[PDB]
Amino acid sequence: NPHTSTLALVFYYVTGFFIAVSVITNVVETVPCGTVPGSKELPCGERYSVAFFCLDTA
Amino acid sequence: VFRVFRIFKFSRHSQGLRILGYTLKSCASELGFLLFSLTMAIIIFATVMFYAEKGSS
């Protein structure tokens, strides 16, 4: 029961947040984003592989 | 677009509209949940149907 304390409530409210963040980014990897003026279109995840990778790690 | 909203003013003239507005505000608890569950089921099956079919002709 997060309602037990206020710290429990805020912890529940912050862990139920990063689940959503990871879901969102797990979706966004497949987006073709950025024109990639030099070559074909890289799905945004692989273009910024460092950003997406580090976020998944965290 | 917004010039459609005036259609709603039939509310006064029509029971159905006001009584529906109320049967919706009362059940506004389960509709948030339905939106949520649909959003999750859609994301699930979108990921699946993507990877199971992303590479084809």
Probe site for chain A from B45, B47, B48, B53 (most A CB atoms < 10 A): B47
- What residues form DSSP beta bridges with A32? A43
Cβ–Cβ under 8 Å, residues A13 and A25:
no
Closest CA to B47 of A57, A28, A41: A28
State the resolution, in angstroms. 3.8
- B50 in reach of chain A (CB within 8 A): yes
Asked if A26's CB is within 8 angstroms of B50's CB, the reply is: no
CA A57 to chain centre: 10
Closest CA to A27 of B52, B39, B43: B43
Per the structure block, which two tokens stand in for B13?
A: 């003239």
Separation CA A58–CA A53 (nearest Å): 9
Q: What is the DSSP letter of B13?
A: T
Cβ–Cβ under 8 Å, residues A29 and A52:
yes
Report the Cα–Cα distance between both ends of chain B, in Å, rounded.
40
Residue whose pair of structure tokens reads 């862990």 in the numeric block: A15
Q: At what angle do helices B28-51 and A6-28 cross, to 10 degrees?
A: 40
- B22 in reach of chain A (CB within 8 A): no
What is the CA angle B53-A26-A11, rounded to 5?
145
Sequence-distant (6+) residues with CB within 8 A of A8 are: A1, A2
Asked if B43's CB is within 8 angstroms of A27's CB, the reply is: yes
Task: Identify how the structure was determined.
Answer: cryo-EM
Closest CA to A32 of B15, B54, B38, B4: B54
